[PDB]
Amino acid sequence: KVINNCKIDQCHAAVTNHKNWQYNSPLVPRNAELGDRKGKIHIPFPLANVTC
Amino acid sequence: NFNVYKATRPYLAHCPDCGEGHSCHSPIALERIRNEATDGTLKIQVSLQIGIK
Amino acid sequence: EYKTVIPSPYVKCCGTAECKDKSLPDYSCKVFTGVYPFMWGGAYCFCDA
Amino acid sequence: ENTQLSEAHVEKSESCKTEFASAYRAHTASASAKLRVLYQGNNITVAAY
Amino acid sequence: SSSLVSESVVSLAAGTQAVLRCQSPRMVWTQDRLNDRQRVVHWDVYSTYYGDNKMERLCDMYSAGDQRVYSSYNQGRIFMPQNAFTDGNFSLVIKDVAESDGGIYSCNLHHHYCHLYETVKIQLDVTKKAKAAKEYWDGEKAVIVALEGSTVMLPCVNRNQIWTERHLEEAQQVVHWDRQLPGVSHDRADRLLDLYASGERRAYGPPFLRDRVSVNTNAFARGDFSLRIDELERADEGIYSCHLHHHYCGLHERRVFHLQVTEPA
Amino acid sequence: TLTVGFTDSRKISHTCTHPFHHEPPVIGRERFHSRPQHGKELPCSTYVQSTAA
Amino acid sequence: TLTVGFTDSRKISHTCTHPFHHEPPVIGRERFHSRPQHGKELPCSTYVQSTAATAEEIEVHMPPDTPDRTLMTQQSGNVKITVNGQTVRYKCNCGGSNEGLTTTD
Numbered sequence A: 001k002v003i004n005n006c007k008i009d010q011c012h013a014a015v016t017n018h019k020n021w022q023y024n025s026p027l028v029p030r031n032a033e034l035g036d037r038k039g040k041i042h043i044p045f046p047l048a049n050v051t052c
Numbered sequence B: 001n002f003n004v005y006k007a008t009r010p011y012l013a014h015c016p017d018c019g020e021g022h023s024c025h026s027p028i029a030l031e032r033i034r035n036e037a038t039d040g041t042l043k044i045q046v047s048l049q050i051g052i053k
Numbered sequence C: 001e002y003k004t005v006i007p008s009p010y011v012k013c014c015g016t017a018e019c020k021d022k023s024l025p026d027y028s029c030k031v032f033t034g035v036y037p038f039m040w041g042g043a044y045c046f047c048d049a
Numbered sequence D: 001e002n003t004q005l006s007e008a009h010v011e012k013s014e015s016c017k018t019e020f021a022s023a024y025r026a027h028t029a030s031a032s033a034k035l036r037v038l039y040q041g042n043n044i045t046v047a048a049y
Numbered sequence E: 001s002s003s004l005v006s007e008s009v010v011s012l013a014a015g016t017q018a019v020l021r022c023q024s025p026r027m028v029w030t031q032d033r034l035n036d037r038q039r040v041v042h043w044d045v046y047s048t049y050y051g052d053n054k055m056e057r058l059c060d061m062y063s064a065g066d067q068r069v070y071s072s073y074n075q076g077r078i079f080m081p082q083n084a085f086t087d088g089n090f091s092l093v094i095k096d097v098a099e100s101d102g103g104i105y106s107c108n109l110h111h112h113y114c115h116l117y118e119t120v121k122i123q124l125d126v127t128k129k130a131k132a133a134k135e136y137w138d139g140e141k142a143v144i145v146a147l148e149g150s151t152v153m154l155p156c157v158n159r160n161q162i163w164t165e166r167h168l169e170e171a172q173q174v175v176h177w178d179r180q181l182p183g184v185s186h187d188r189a190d191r192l193l194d195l196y197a198s199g200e201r202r203a204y205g206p207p208f209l210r211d212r213v214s215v216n217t218n219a220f221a222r223g224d225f226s227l228r229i230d231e232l233e234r235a236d237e238g239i240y241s242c243h244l245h246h247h248y249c250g251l252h253e254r255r256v257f258h259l260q261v262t263e264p265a
Numbered sequence F: 001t002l003t004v005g006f007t008d009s010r011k012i013s014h015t016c017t018h019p020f021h022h023e024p025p026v027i028g029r030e031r032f033h034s035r036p037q038h039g040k041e042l043p044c045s046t047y048v049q050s051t052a053a
Numbered sequence G: 001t002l003t004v005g006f007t008d009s010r011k012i013s014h015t016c017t018h019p020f021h022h023e024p025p026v027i028g029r030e031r032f033h034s035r036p037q038h039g040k041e042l043p044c045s046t047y048v049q050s051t052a053a054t055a056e057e058i059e060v061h062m063p064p065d066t067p068d069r070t071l072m073t074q075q076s077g078n079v080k081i082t083v084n085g086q087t088v089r090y091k092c093n094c095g096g097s098n099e100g101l102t103t104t105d
């Protein structure tokens, strides 16, 4: 697209990707609608106590 | 040319540590450490041969 | 400084070893039973205990 | 004009299912014991509260 | 709960040290955890065409490797996929087949941890040229009329999760010893003893009954978990259940001993 | 401290680090730093290679 | 601690380690850690690159054996032991040929 007679530094634009989900982290900003969203994954490498 | 090791062979012995905590059998078992030298250089005895084919 | 010499230990199965005195400085010996050592290729021998 | 909202909470760890420290209020106790008795020329073992 | 493998019935008198022989040759849990995920595949050929040719162990593979050649003459003569363990290809390739390499081949695989083995037979007849080079089935194996002076392939199409490359030593043996009294049900037997390959041992019941019922110090290292009960008390009679579980090898064995304790009269 | 690094298909080295004080807890009275060929055995928590939580 | 490691023709890294407390002895009063461009000279024991010793003997003996069962394989209750060109002593609790040293499959 083209917006004529306007400075490039006028504003910003962002690509809105919603295809492959991204797993939550504090650093990443939220999507700004609510807290949680569907899609959950289990964390591997469980814990057990053994002799040493 | 200091060739006395014709019939020698390497080990494959239970090394105390093969890494990651568990102890297994390796060809690089060591059982003798000499550090009497004042300078600080150390002899290290090793299971397997070196400098030969 | 002194060096400690410990030749290859004597292993045995289904039979028992024995200590013969050695006229050497601080020479010592011992025996044990029920040991079931394992090597890289498997158990050294069958006699379980 | 922009703003930031943050929030957080704290929960139990799954590691608790394996490692943890437990506080009890044990007050009293009971006694059990093992005895060896020479009877009719033989050692005999007994267990009782 | 575990699939039955052996049912035993015994009877003795009170005041006797009985022993139940709950053993499994697959329970030789090596002291060694690491490198037990390793399995070893290889190919060995006997040139029975000559009849006096000692079976040539051509080459072998471990987890994460190549073709290693026993003989230099085989070097530049043999290939095994570096991904054989990953995809289970385990297939041999020979670049320069000739009459010297004619014979019956065998693709063999051994698993260190499970101590299980697999093998597939192949036959490789030699033809001077491709005028008769073809595959057929003798009746027990596959026979290839290899074109002399050409590359040939011997397949090993086992693709069982057991041999697929993996970290499999996360699993370890577990042993359950329980007693079902005359009136208790199987899987409701009091949990007398729990044993783990890492030496963890758990006992239950009254403090004393634990000591008489014992297991050797290093059963896992030998795979013999025989349970010794000392000076049998007649109240101990019943059905003793010994469950041995290690899931990677698929082991879910049950052994049972119907021990009836008598008394002097 | 604790840093991680990797090499890109860009043939570039990307690295990050966090200051995290990693102190293995002394298990038993004998403050040991490499486990022995011979010694006692005690329980201790740890992880495993299973990939199904 | 002290570890050693090497890379195989197997393209594998084999490593071992022993806990050995290595503390160079402070020679002289000045506890120095890297020797200087300028300074005094004092005697100190050390080693040398010579490859001809004088009566420091270490014995070598014939290896006892290496009991490996990979040679075995079950053929419908018939154990097959493969030798591939070595001297192998088999011994079984089974009857018949319980014991025997052979060099043939």
Ligand SMILES: *[C@@H]1O[C@H](CO)[C@@H](O)[C@H](O)[C@H]1NC(C)=O
Pocket: D038, D041, D042, D043
């Ligand atoms: C009883 O215990 C003692 C303790 O040493 C032992 O000497 C003896 O042989 C045992 N048996 C008996 C006294 O019948």
